[PDB]
């Protein structure tokens, strides 16, 4: 289409743009898979037109320049990247190229974190650096000493006088999710994924910040080596590092054929959801150091290793709509409907938006291109909007003011992330739990109205509100499973007796959000009657001891919703009774 010269400048500009956001800012806008796609396109163009490769092309360079706000460390041996493949056929082609230019493979989990180079002198940790641009990195020595998995001293015989240990610092998934949940609720930085949370946690001027983040580390390789020797195979070196106290993954594996490599790759992909940390693939390395040294390096990567990538855990797609799911207790979760896309190999077409505050934090509009993440058998999540690709036609996301299931008021209370349907007494989405609550022991306490009886009444649409329970005839109950004429009359009798209650237990039975047994008793004692309570403003409700803004808001919004007032009127009409004050 466009001239090859225009294609080249566009690709180089785009790749550097995202390299800056990823390597320098730990804040990428596009998925790793999209960057990898663009890099493949540039590689294909340069392979067809090798005369157009420049020494500063992204295919010839590593990482990004180190932040000058950090002290800087010149690696004593260059740090590089890895060239990659995405399918078995391409790995086999790499295997053949290697065989024809010289084999045992040392095969390792490819950890999705950031690279670090740790210098030990006489077995003592003396410095540690990020990769930077492969020549100069950022001094993160103080930060690395907060990482328990990285030893400060090596213990053993034959420790070389000077040794750079290289490995990946990374942040397990549970630690990542905690950091992001906290950040969403406090206004801090929300990270795209564990890689970026690990990088941002590590690359702190103040190491006390790093120390509070659950970073860990695995070794994977060697930089400078002086004043001593190491084993003559890569796995041998890793096992020596392990003996000296450095952390080595228990999945490092030898393979004596290309087909063994494929078997390991596929088992690791199968085991991926169980590991507790992100891996973007497996790294496959010529095991013999002599063979590694013969093959050497190109500008960006070794010629003796390949990153065999998995289908990526983040992908981009378009938001076609936003649906608002109503949960069993009235929570309204915004869920994006998406153009279908495979994430980590699994076809998905929705993703959670968490809540209304998160929609606003994202800046999401219908029609946006978004990054979504799926790591495990869970609903995917929207990560961010790809704002640089926002179409000219997008639509505002209007969070519902009324429940999409029952039409009752939706409530959002300041400081609370979750919006809720207020119509707990009528909402179909809440009906099973609301009726079970209503007849429970500390509420109306109806003998024989068990969960399986309630389930049938709801599923057959025989009951829609708690008032309908008192309208049940013995004949209608008899028609249910688990019910006979005797138990049907038993529960009709039990419902008639249950009309005798207290103001506190009736209030508790209504199922207002956050109103526990003690709060119900306090509201009943303060206001004395239902008429006084149902009239109270939020400020009036806040007068009550142990009732704050959240409970006051829920109570006021509950009684302001017409469907609740209608059910309460019906309950009184059916004869529910409590003592006057
Ligand atoms: N989303 C974006 O905008 C964006 C931008 C630039 C780069 N990236 C991502 O960065 C990567 C490309 O750059 P890169 O140089 O960081 O490459 P990489 O992470 O794909 O491969 C090289 C790295 O693998 C790491 N590694 C992990 N486990 C290893 C093991 N067992 N043995 C050896 N090395 C191991 C090393 O730190 C090494 O630097 C791709 O994942 C790319 O998608 C993303
Ligand atoms: Mg990486
Ligand atoms: Zn509702």
From Swiss-Prot:
One of its GO terms (cellular component) is cytosol. Changing residue 482 to A: Reduces nick joining activity by over 90%. It is an enzyme of class 6 (ligase). NAD(+) binds at residues 32-36, 81-82, 108, 131, 168, 285, 309. DNA ligase that catalyzes the formation of phosphodiester linkages between 5'-phosphoryl and 3'-hydroxyl groups in double-stranded DNA using NAD as a coenzyme and as the energy source for the reaction. It is essential for DNA replication and repair of damaged DNA. Changing residue 329 to A: Abolishes nick joining activity. Changing residue 548 to D/V: Reduces nick joining activity by 95%. HAMAP family: DNA_ligase_A. It comes from the Bacteria. Belongs to the NAD-dependent DNA ligase family. LigA subfamily. Changing residue 328 to A/Q: Reduces nick joining activity by over 95%. Abolishes nick joining activity. Changing residue 36 to N: Reduces nick joining activity by 88%. The lineage of its organism: Bacteria, Pseudomonadati, Pseudomonadota, Gammaproteobacteria, Enterobacterales. It catalyses: NAD(+) + (deoxyribonucleotide)n-3'-hydroxyl + 5'-phospho-(deoxyribonucleotide)m = (deoxyribonucleotide)n+m + AMP + beta-nicotinamide D-nucleotide. Its cofactor is Mg(2+). InterPro entries: BRCT_dom, BRCT_dom_sf, DisA/LigA_HHH, DNA_ligase, DNA_ligase_AS, DNA_ligase_CS, DNAligase_adenylation, DNAligase_N. Changing residue 203 to A/K/Q: Reduces nick joining activity by 99%. GO terms for molecular function: DNA binding; DNA ligase (NAD+) activity; metal ion binding; NAD+ binding. Zn(2+) binds at residues 403, 406, 421, 427. Changing residue 280 to N: Reduces nick joining activity by 99%. Residues 325-329, 448-453, 514-519, 546-551 are annotated as: Interaction with target DNA. One of its GO terms (biological process) is DNA replication. It comes from Escherichia coli (strain K12). Changing residue 133 to A: Reduces nick joining activity by 63%. This is DNA ligase. The keyword Chaperone does not apply. Changing residue 35 to S: Reduces nick joining activity by 99.9%.
């Amino acid at each position: 289409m466009e001239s090859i010269e225009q294609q080249l400048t566009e690709l180089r500009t785009t790749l550097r743009h995202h390299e800056y956001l990823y390597h320098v800012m730990d804040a990428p806008e596009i998925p790793d898979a999209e960057y990898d796609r663009l890099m493949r396109e540039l590689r294909e163009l340069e392979t067809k037109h090798p005369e157009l490769i420049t020494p500063d092309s992204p295919t010839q360079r590593v990482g990004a320049a180190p932040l000058a706000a950090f002290s800087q460390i010149r690696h004593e041996v260059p740090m590089l990247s890895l060239d990659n493949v995405f399918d078995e056929e391409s790995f086999l082609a790499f295997n053949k190229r290697v065989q024809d230019r010289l084999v045992t493979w040392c095969c390792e989990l490819m950890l999705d974190g950031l690279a670090v180079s740790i210098l030990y002198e006489n077995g003592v940790l003396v410095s540690a650096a990020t990769r930077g641009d492969g020549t100069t990195g950022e001094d993160i020595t103080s930060n690395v000493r907060t990482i328990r998995a990285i030893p400060l001293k090596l213990h053993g015989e034959n420790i070389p006088a000077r040794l750079e240990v290289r490995g990946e610092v990374f942040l397990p998934q549970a630690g990542f999710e905690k950091i992001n949940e906290d950040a969403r609720r406090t206004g801090g930085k929300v990270f795209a994924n564990p890689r970026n949370a690990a990088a941002g946690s590590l690359r702190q001027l103040d190491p006390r910040i790093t120390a509070k983040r659950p970073l860990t580390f695995f070794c994977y390789g060697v930089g400078v080596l002086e004043g001593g020797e190491l084993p003559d195979t890569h796995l041998g070196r890793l096992l020596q590092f392990k003996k000296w106290g450095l952390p080595v993954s228990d999945r490092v594996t030898l393979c004596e054929s290309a087909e063994e490599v494929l078997a390991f790759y596929h088992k690791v992909e199968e085991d991926r959801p169980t590991l507790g940390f992100d891996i973007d693939g497996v790294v496959i390395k010529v095991n013999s150091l002599a063979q590694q040294e013969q093959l050497g390096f190109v500008a960006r990567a070794p010629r003796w290793a390949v990153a065999f990538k998995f289908p990526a855990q983040e992908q981009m797609t378009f938001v076609r709509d936003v649906e608002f799911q109503v949960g069993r207790t009235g929570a309204i979760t915004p869920v994006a409907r998406l153009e279908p896309v495979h994430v980590a190999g699994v076809l998905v077409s929705n993703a959670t938006l968490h809540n209304a505050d998160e929609i606003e934090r994202l800046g999401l509009r219908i029609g946006d291109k978004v990054v979504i993440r799926r790591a495990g058998d869970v609903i995917p999540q929207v990560v961010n909007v790809v704002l640089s690709e926002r179409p000219e036609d997008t639509r505002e996301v209007v969070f519902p003011t009324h429940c999409p299931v029952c039409g009752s008021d939706v409530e959002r209370v300041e400081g609370e992330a979750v919006a809720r349907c207020t119509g707990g007494l009528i909402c179909g989405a809440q009906r099973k739990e609301s009726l079970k609550h209503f007849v429970s022991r500390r509420a109306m306490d109806v003998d024989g109205m068990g969960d399986k009886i309630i389930d049938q009444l709801v599923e057959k649409e025989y009951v829609h509100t708690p008032a309908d329970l008192f309208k049940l005839t013995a004949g209608k109950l008899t028609g249910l499973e688990r019910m006979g004429p005797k138990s049907a009359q038993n529960v009709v009798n039990a419902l008639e007796k249950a009309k005798e209650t207290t103001f506190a237990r009736f209030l508790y039975a209504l199922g207002i959000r956050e109103v526990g047994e003690a709060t119900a008793a306090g509201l009943a004692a303060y206001f004395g009657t239902l008429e006084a309570l149902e009239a109270a403003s939020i400020e009036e409700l806040q007068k009550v001891p142990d009732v704050g803004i959240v409970v006051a808001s829920h109570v006021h919004n509950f009684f302001a919703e017409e469907s609740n007032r209608n059910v309460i009127s019906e309950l009184l009409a059916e004869g529910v009774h409590w003592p006057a004050p």
